């Protein structure tokens, strides 16, 4: 993996994540004043759980479909096997809704952009689900403070999706190459443009997996309650 094929490598990422980011950061920062009036929270509050889960479901499921067109538009994605892709898929896709939440997050007022305005954590409240959200908001707050930018995000979601020691892969070594590419690719755009700083400041790789997977959790109850 030369210097040309880094490069190129680092190019394509970048532009198959500005055509798969779902919203545009320019828009998201625009609606920034665009807030949830007391009213309007209250409304969210008084709905029933069930409403809200369906609600939360749909926006998720919308969500993980762009993360979805983000990995098939990745070359050495779409040259894993099927089952390799699934795998992959299966273990990632929220990991990367989850890390993708920060640019839709607000740290100045902790408030997230959800249908249409941005609302803080209590807009969710129906739920039940206070500490898993409040997590979600802790680990958005804690990435926006890295000010990653748009390139950033798209090698790191990346590195979320491929990485080789998801269980149940057929062709490990093949991803472990692509992988090592990627971290490659990476490290090789943060010298290029002076943010090897941030490599310090990312999250150990196990914090975004445990919160995925108690958030893993808590939807498939849901699921089995109340099918969507
Ligand atoms: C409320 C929520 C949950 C927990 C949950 C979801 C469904 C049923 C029960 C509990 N998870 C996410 C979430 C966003 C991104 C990944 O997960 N949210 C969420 C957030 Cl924190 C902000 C905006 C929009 C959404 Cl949907």
Redesign the pocket.
């Given at each position: 993996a030369s210097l040309t094929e880094i490069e190129h490598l680092v190019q394509s990422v970048c532009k198959s994540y500005r055509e798969t980011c779902q919203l545009r950061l320019e828009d998201l920062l625009r609606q920034r004043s665009n807030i949830f009036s007391r009213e309007e929270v209250t409304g969210y509050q008084r709905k029933s759980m069930w409403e809200?889960?369906e609600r939360?479901?749909h926006?998720?499921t919308e969500?993980i479909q762009y993360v979805v067109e983000f990995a098939k538009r990745l070359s050495g994605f779409m040259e894993l096997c099927q089952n390799d892709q699934i795998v992959l898929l299966k273990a990632g896709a929220?990991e990367v809704?989850?890390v993708r939440?920060c640019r839709a997050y607000n740290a100045d007022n902790r408030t997230?952009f959800?249908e249409g305005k941005y609302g803080g954590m209590e807009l969710?409240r129906a739920?039940g689900?206070s500490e898993?959200?409040s997590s979600?908001?802790d680990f958005s707050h804690s990435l926006s403070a890295l000010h990653f930018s748009e390139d950033e995000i798209a090698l790191y979601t990346a590195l979320v999706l491929i990485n080789a020691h998801r269980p149940g892969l057929q062709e490990k070594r093949k991803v472990e190459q692509l992988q090592y590419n990627l971290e490659l690719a990476f490290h090789h755009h943060l010298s290029k443009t002076h943010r090897q700083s941030i490599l310090a400041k990312l999250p150990p790789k196990g914090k975004l997996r445990s919160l995925c997977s108690q958030?893993v959790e808590?939807?498939q109850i849901?699921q089995h309650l109340h099918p969507i």
């Open positions: 809200m889960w939360c479901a926006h998720l969500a929220m809704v989850l939440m997230v959800f969710f739920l689900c898993l959200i979600i908001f958030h808590r939807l849901f």
